[model samples]
Target: HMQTLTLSPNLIGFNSNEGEKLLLTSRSREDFFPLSMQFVTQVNQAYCGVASIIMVLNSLGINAPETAQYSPYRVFTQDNFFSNEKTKAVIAPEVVARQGMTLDELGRLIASYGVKVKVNHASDTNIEDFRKQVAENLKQDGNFVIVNYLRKEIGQERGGHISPLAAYNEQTDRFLIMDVSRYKYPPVWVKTTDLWKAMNTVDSVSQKTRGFVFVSKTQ
Candidate 1:
């Protein structure tokens, strides 16, 4: 069964001002997918990357060693019993550290696991061709892509968010954005072109345009 999307509102520092945007967005083929069910409760304000990484590790059967600082519950001390063993194991302390990960830090962490992670920048290529590249990359099997973008452009109030792209719908040319911010929005099937536009923005921190990474287990 899919996790119900009816939880109490908890923006956790999301774009609370633009709450109107949520109603404008649409859902994908698997609106109720179980993949995102395990991550409804992120540990911190900036834990999207941590949650996405956990999902990636779980799908690949890679167990991130459990650590002393990891908590299976939200910061509020609520029960997160739905969290699975793989998820609990991979939600390492360093991964969910309050500071969160920068682009470089995320790459290094994945590489430490012996995973071959190719970082792709929206600044370096044809923005419109991103969908084709994503499709080809995922065809390799055991491959997944995590995207970093300005969520505001994608019909959401928040800016600069991360999520895993689980599947693509060829007929509609929509990509399933398995958004880790479940409290803000559920999994949605965003048009590929729209996604490209959303991701094709500059990151203020690095002065580099936002992008996605193709992750595959090389071990």
Candidate 2:
């Protein structure tokens, strides 16, 4: 399952518009998690989370590694999120659009895994339970791992980036973060403070954020 953490807005302050950015300093190479995942949703757009991950993993394949990282995926409200039964549909066009891609293309990419994808309803609170469920799948089976990133200190509307957790150095109290939005590839490790802000999109403001890490292997 996931061991969620919080990035406090006290780092940025409450009035922050959420349109924030942070510099990610690079760190050396670390162990690669086969299926590390991360997500960030709108103010509360966490509805399709279960479906999203199922599709993402199916596309990646069963050979995924253990202890992967994931990002916060939220469902902001019942309207924009669970608007209609169509929202429960499999990888719809709008969902793909959010990824800045097309559903056909995404499906084409996923068809190779030959795995069925399903989404059961889930409560958004205390998601670390789910994280641990998935991470264990990876560590024990060597098939999958999922770690999540979410900030309890901030709401989705005000929150921004959804970066991956790559490395953690307890000695320095820092977690390495990988940011794709920064025009960077393969992501890089950032300090815990930087990651805390990146999660909330503040200069250095840390918001209380908690996310999930889950890994599941095919039976």
Candidate 3:
């Protein structure tokens, strides 16, 4: 049976507290926000739906962070229905899936803006590479890096956080940014470490992100 969580009277949608923190940091501070995180938790799809919503707001030039309202788009997360949007996890694995996106497509998208994605495509791409890539990608509007890890991180591990690549110190090989997790919400920093051991353990996970989606105004 389908389940529904509401955030207010008469309005309904999936409860999205889980995505609030991550969304805030990703949108407000600007960071490397991954849609893959959408598949890690129970509300993964629904929460990511919220992420999509934030982007809609941004595209429309709405300031979602100006108030205590986590999402200023008047999304009715309580009702099982809404005007035109249902805030539902309708995309199934069999129908629509996530991949990091094709190399050519990704390159074209970023280049369209005359911006570089600055992806971590080192010969030895690993988990920490993803962490660093994500950090680096967040700094630029169209730039983003992906960290793939099949060499490590599996068998029931957990890791989740999003940080903007505010400033990278070549001298120390470090990056800085705003954060929004238990460890750091307004700002958090991490060192380059292989993070594959913590996520996407499925054997087929690698191919899943091959054609991954890079967020855009029309996408």
Candidate 4:
């Protein structure tokens, strides 16, 4: 189970009155509309990375495979995400169910879908650079950001987690995390420093620092 961050002063719930105001002039809100429109919750506890990738893939309007559920029309869905042979070769669905994907694994899997992918380990980048990259990416279209972080560092009860970012509030110096674990927590805005700290933590499974992934459709 994941702990709620509602009580943290550093976090602003995106559905709250204060958060709505932040979105009003947030320079990094360009990705919010598209991401929110395609937002999805993780169907399984281990599917945070899967859910996040699906959201960005759909948001970018990339060509998706036709599934039995949504046949004739194509769209990315959690159930169909692993249907791709390339993705399954990266990590079998059963393996992912037991152990979630790491930062590099997440990048490789997404890249298999034919999108441009960049993976950054938190240890390789400082907080200031992280903020600059996230803010700049959020301000533009055609790209999306997904973070792999330890929830405990951010005052949450979980271990490692992944989610897509929505917006950034310059005045508050916070970034909106579109957390895919909707059943456990609402979308919340986290301070850049705190998020960076969370991302910098090492993952016991991967034995590597957690990080972020940047994805964009290839022309």
User: Candidates' TM-scores?
Assistant: 0.68, 0.35, 0.33, 0.95
The worst-scoring run of ten residues by lDDT in candidate 1 lies at 73-82
Clashing pairs in 4: none
Q: Candidate 1, TM-score vs. the true structure? A: 0.68
lDDT of each: 0.60, 0.32, 0.30, 0.90
Model 2 agreement with the true structure over 81-137: per-residue lDDT tens digits: 223344335355455445422222223323333333222112233334333333233
- The 10 consecutive residues of candidate 2 with the worst lDDT sum are 19-28
Q: Give the runs in model 4 whose Cα sits over 4 Å from its true position.
A: 1-5
Give per-residue CA lDDT, model 3, range 1-219, as digits (tens). 124222222111112342333333442224334322211221232232222323323333322233335444442221211123221222222221243222333334233322233333233355555554554445555333322223223211123222223333333333332221212122222223322332233324233322112333333
Off by over 4 Å in 1: 1-40, 67-99
Give candidate 1's root-mean-square deviation (CA, Å): 8.7
Report each candidate's C-alpha RMSD, comma-separated, in the order given.
8.7, 13.7, 12.6, 2.3
How does candidate 4 score on lDDT? Answer: 0.90
Q: Pick the candidate with the highest TM-score.
A: 4
Leading candidate by lDDT: 4
lDDT for model 3 = 0.30
- Residue 110 local lDDT, model 2: 32
> How would you encode candidate 1's per-residue C-alpha lDDT over 77-104 as one tens digit per residue?
2122114443334345444455555454
**For candidate 3, what is the total of clashing residue pairs?**
29
